[PDB]
RNA sequence: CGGUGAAAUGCGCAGAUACCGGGAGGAACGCCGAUGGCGAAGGCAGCCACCUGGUCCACCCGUGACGCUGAGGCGCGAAAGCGUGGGGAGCAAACCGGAUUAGAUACCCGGGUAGUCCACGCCCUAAACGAUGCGCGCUAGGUCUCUGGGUCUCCUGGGGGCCGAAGCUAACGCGUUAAGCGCGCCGCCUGGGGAGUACGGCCGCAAGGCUGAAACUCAAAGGAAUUGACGGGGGCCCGCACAAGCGGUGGA
């Protein structure tokens, strides 16, 4: 899980990309509570949040694949 | 004649014909070859054996030019969107690797009936 | 058979040579269980091979038998409201039944009168790579990869 | 190229398709997103800021019964639909053609106008459904979940679910989110069809809507469960039932 390999940050923090990366998928979507291992709370803000960080476009909207 | 080695490989691929498209380096196209454009005609060109030729008479067309190098691209959800590319990976091309930027809309146009 | 793969018989080898594909070949020219003259039969045809060729007719047999084995057929299928021919890998037991089988109705189609005679004929002209027996083998695989449209079943 | 079970209608040598770059515009807003949250309902999902309602918790501080319901009235009221104007990418009634078929005024395919988006104004209906009026008290728990307070491996408040005591129910089911035990207050029912019609009035630009009978006619209409059969429903299993094979009848 994510939350557990990693440590303290800030769920609000929209610059942070170094964290927020961790966050999206190997295409550009958000991951799954499944994955982030988040809680209700938790998730429900790194939503708004990433969906800020795309804006000033230092988050991805969308990936490509690539293991080949 | 033209002498460009190295290029790109787009394989677009539907529920009704499956097609390639060669192109160099900057995004130009080459060569292209299709399905109806093998000899099929209908229901046929949506079978893998279809994409097969049309992946590898696609890639005789870029001999022709010399190509050696393949960076693959492939678009849709086709039946046999793999037998293309497992295609051209022994057309006699150096596959450098297969990218998938299938298109998807994040809700806009509301589709027709069938979905 | 819905229970089970169900056995295969098993047969006594041959009096003379003693290969079962021998006995089996034999049963199939047998009509009418008169299986006292097909016996005949392979034998006069083989001393005609002997006649006919500096070759050992016990090899001769076998070699023809190897020639004519497809290893690749169609077997109909109906998906799409449709028959859509679908070539496949023959099995090894499939394979010996549809050699002598054709080894046979081939070779009485022969022009030749004597039925030995056919058969002697048809031994030859198998392990030559000719005739009809091959051609009955080469004509299955031209439909084996000629509709390989839709080996994805 | 497209599209289908197949096909054709259509689009392409004025050069389509597939591919790169640039520009216009409309609509909608992937992932997160849930069996989640919110709201009186209808309804509400990119991001931001402003304006604005409701609500929950803790403290227990203040007023001092100031409460509940709620005929008529007033406002809100999906979709479609009407007026004026704007807008029009995609979709698409009607309509044009294509194939399917005994035929197809359809289901499938290609086009396509209203419309669908916006503003102002009208319409006001609905499986507008938990098909379950609003408010207060009382009656074992278990578990999942949203959310708040706490001395936070446990306690305590509010919401959404599943199982379930007592109880209830025609039965299915319901069960501290009551269909339980009780009080208040409003609305509505009183055999089916005829009818949500007729007539009358009100409302509306129109489409229509609200209210709403009877004659006649039928002995039912109706709910839930049972047992069966049956399904071009499902799972599983058999037989020379198919397959595989040999041999035949159909011919004379």
């Given at each position: 899980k994510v939350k557990a390999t990693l440590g303290e940050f800030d769920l609000r923090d929209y610059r942070n990309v170094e964290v927020l990366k961790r966050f999206l998928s190997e295409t550009g979507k958000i991951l799954p509570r499944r994955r982030t291992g988040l809680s209700g709370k938790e998730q429900r803000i790194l939503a708004k949040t990433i969906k800020r960080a795309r804006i000033l476009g230092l988050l991805p909207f969308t990936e490509k694949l690539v293991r080949k | 004649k033209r002498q460009v080695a190295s290029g790109r490989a787009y394989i677009h691929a539907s529920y009704n014909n499956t097609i390639v498209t060669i192109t160099d380096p900057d995004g130009n196209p080459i060569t292209w070859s299709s399905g109806g454009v093998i000899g099929y005609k209908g229901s046929r060109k949506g079978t893998p054996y279809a994409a097969q030729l049309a992946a590898l008479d696609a890639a005789k067309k870029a001999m022709a030019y010399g190509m050696q190098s393949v960076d693959v691209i492939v678009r849709g959800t086709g039946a046999g969107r793999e037998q293309a590319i497992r295609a051209l990976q022994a057309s006699g091309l150096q596959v450098k690797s297969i990218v998938d930027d299938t298109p998807v809309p994040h809700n806009g146009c509301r589709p027709k009936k069938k979905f | 058979?819905?229970?089970?793969?169900?056995?295969?018989?098993?047969?006594?080898?041959?009096?003379?040579?003693?290969?079962?594909?021998?006995?089996?070949?034999?049963?199939?020219?047998?009509?009418?269980?008169?299986?006292?003259?097909?016996?005949?039969?392979?034998?006069?045809?083989?001393?005609?091979?002997?006649?006919?060729?500096?070759?050992?007719?016990?090899?001769?047999?076998?070699?023809?038998?190897?020639?004519?084995?497809?290893?690749?057929?169609?077997?109909?299928?109906?998906?799409?409201?449709?028959?859509?021919?679908?070539?496949?890998?023959?099995?090894?037991?499939?394979?010996?039944?549809?050699?002598?089988?054709?080894?046979?109705?081939?070779?009485?189609?022969?022009?030749?009168?004597?039925?030995?005679?056919?058969?002697?004929?048809?031994?030859?002209?198998?392990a030559e790579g000719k005739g009809g027996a091959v051609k009955k083998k080469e004509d299955v695989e031209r439909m084996a990869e000629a509709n390989r449209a839709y080996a994805h079943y």
């Open positions: - | - | 058979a819905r229970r089970r793969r169900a056995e295969v018989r098993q047969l006594q080898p041959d009096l003379v040579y003693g290969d079962v594909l021998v006995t089996a070949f034999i049963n199939k020219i047998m009509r009418d269980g008169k299986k006292n003259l097909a016996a005949r039969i392979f034998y006069d045809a083989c001393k005609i091979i002997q006649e006919k060729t500096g070759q050992e007719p016990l090899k001769v047999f076998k070699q023809a038998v190897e020639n004519v084995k497809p290893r690749m057929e169609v077997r109909s299928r109906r998906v799409g409201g449709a028959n859509y021919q679908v070539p496949m890998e023959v099995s090894p037991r499939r394979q010996q039944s549809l050699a002598l089988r054709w080894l046979v109705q081939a070779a009485n189609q022969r022009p030749e009168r004597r039925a030995a005679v056919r058969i002697a004929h048809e031994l030859m002209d198998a």
